[PDB]
Design a protein around this ligand. Structure first.
Ligand SMILES: Cc1noc(C)c1-c1ccc2c(Nc3ccccc3C(C)(C)C)c(C(=O)O)cnc2c1
Ligand SMILES: Cc1noc(C)c1-c1ccc2c(Nc3ccccc3C(C)(C)C)c(C(=O)O)cnc2c1
Lengths: 112, 111
């Protein structure tokens, strides 16, 4: 449990999880529920906040950069799969802006 | 803007690393929609961004804070993902650079 990972859990995840646009990102994309038969053909590494949160709670990550990559994958998957004009893209952009804003003030040195 | 410890890190450490990367060449200048034959590019991408513009902004003390510079990097990558087809090589090139960007940002001074 590094200083950086504590920050990602207590500051970054806390801010994103409770955001009003967070709800579509709190669980894995359910391609059956959403009627997206090509989703898993296009997106090869699904990721969502729920998985990241669980990974933070269970000390899954060894470095803060690893957690940051999961956040990045979640957002990137959204931009790659969806149409430019889909509202979900706007929601992702809003959350990612907060992610980056908060990450700018994360502790510098990974020390266990 | 102003000169900060974080902005100098983004300029001298992060941007320098990304700039020289073998996949960086398409990102060093604005997307030229005419030259590339992409007449819909500016109809889809409303805030174009590239590392050349970011580099010049760093050089001219345009940014007031590191987060502002980081947002421009994010816009550049996001534009790429939004516009291009999932199977386009440019998407893989962006992903590779973006992973480096995040790796380096993780070691930026907290201030
Ligand atoms: C995130 C994400 N990344 O790719 C996709 C695809 C999603 C995504 C998109 C929509 C979801 C959703 N419904 C929703 C959410 C926002 C705008 C519009 C919609 C529609 C048009 C589908 C109703 C739900 C939901 O409605 O429960 C859940 N997860 C989503 C994930
Ligand atoms: C970056 C970026 N973001 O959106 C787009 C669109 C670009 C982009 C894509 C291609 C460019 C390019 N040619 C290139 C680069 C990589 C793979 C394939 C190509 C093609 C098929 C077009 C030859 C050049 C170039 O060839 O000079 C410049 N900028 C590009 C920007």
């Amino acid at each position: 449990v590094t200083n950086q990972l504590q920050y990602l859990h207590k500051v970054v995840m806390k801010a994103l999880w409770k955001h009003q646009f967070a709800w579509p990102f709190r669980q894995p994309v359910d391609a059956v529920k959403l009627g997206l038969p090509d989703y898993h053909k296009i997106i090869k590494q699904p990721m969502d906040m729920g998985t990241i949160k669980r990974r933070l709670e269970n000390n899954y990550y060894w470095a803060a950069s690893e957690c940051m990559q999961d956040f990045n994958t979640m957002f990137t998957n959204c931009y790659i799969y969806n149409k430019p004009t889909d509202d979900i893209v706007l929601m992702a952009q809003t959350l990612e802006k907060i992610f980056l804003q908060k990450v700018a003030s994360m502790p510098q040195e990974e020390q266990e």
